[PDB]
Curated annotation (Swiss-Prot), chain B:
<dbReference type="GO" id="GO:0006355">
    <property type="term" value="P:regulation of DNA-templated transcription"/>
</dbReference>
<protein>
    <recommendedName>
        <fullName>Probable csgAB operon transcriptional regulatory protein</fullName>
    </recommendedName>
</protein>
<keyword id="KW-0238">DNA-binding</keyword>
<keyword id="KW-0805">Transcription regulation</keyword>
<comment type="function">
    <text>The master regulator for adhesive curli fimbriae expression; necessary for transcription of the csgAB operon. Plays a positive role in biofilm formation.</text>
</comment>
<dbReference type="GO" id="GO:0003677">
    <property type="term" value="F:DNA binding"/>
</dbReference>
<keyword id="KW-0804">Transcription</keyword>
Length: 137, 132
């Protein structure tokens, strides 16, 4: 349960609803967090960051941009993909640096809280089939 | 009264809808801004997500919401804030405009005002609407 530790970085289109989701995750997880505009560059990324990368706001350019500059880091960070297309290819997921989970659900907040509680415990959030793909390799 | 959040479907949109439903004690639904809508029940409070609206979609939603059940209320969500007053005025059944993308409590308080029959406009925008 460390605060230094872990912090949420929600990278998406800034919106009232993104704020509502971030506040809900912060309160449910008892963690600090911030929202960052997916279309804006970032220089300062804290060490414990759990990046929630909004795939519905990402195109090929932004995927490349966020893959490129997050790989420069670590900095001990974890990337989880949010609002992920069904059938986003496994080959593409693997190419994300520091990839720790994939969220598909657009309706089940509780699903997502539970997954993030796992990440705080050192667990990834992958289906059995995707974890197997990633492990082997 | 029921909430009709018209936006791009996303986990965060569901999170906001749930928070508004729970804060206001009303039912609500999410509708994809890029899809047509047939039936709008009476007493709907439409939250129209301006960040997901381009000029074709504004024209579409202005057109079909002015048809289809004049017993509705429209509020603009995530409004750019230099959105022109004359544009706001052209929305049918316009009852409020939210600019804040960070202050949920502001917005809840505004929607509880709308439920009491109040509008949610800045003083200057209200003055513009009244004297038009
Ligand atoms: Mg849809
Ligand atoms: Mg406001």
């Amino acid at each position: 349960h460390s605060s230094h530790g872990h912090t949420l970085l929600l990278i998406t289109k800034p919106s009232l609803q993104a704020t509502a989701l971030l506040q809900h995750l912060k309160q449910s997880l008892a963690i600090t967090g911030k929202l960052h505009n997916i279309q804006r560059s970032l220089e300062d990324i804290s060490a414990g960051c759990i990046v929630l990368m909004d795939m519905m706001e990402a195109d090929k350019k932004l995927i490349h941009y966020w893959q490129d500059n997050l790989s420069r880091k670590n900095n001990n960070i974890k990337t989880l993909l949010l609002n992920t297309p069904d059938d986003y290819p496994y080959r593409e997921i693997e190419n994300w640096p520091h990839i720790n989970g994939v969220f598909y659900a657009t309706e089940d907040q509780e699903h997502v809280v539970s997954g993030l509680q796992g990440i705080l415990r050192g667990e990834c959030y992958f289906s059995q089939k995707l974890a197997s793909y990633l492990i082997t390799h």
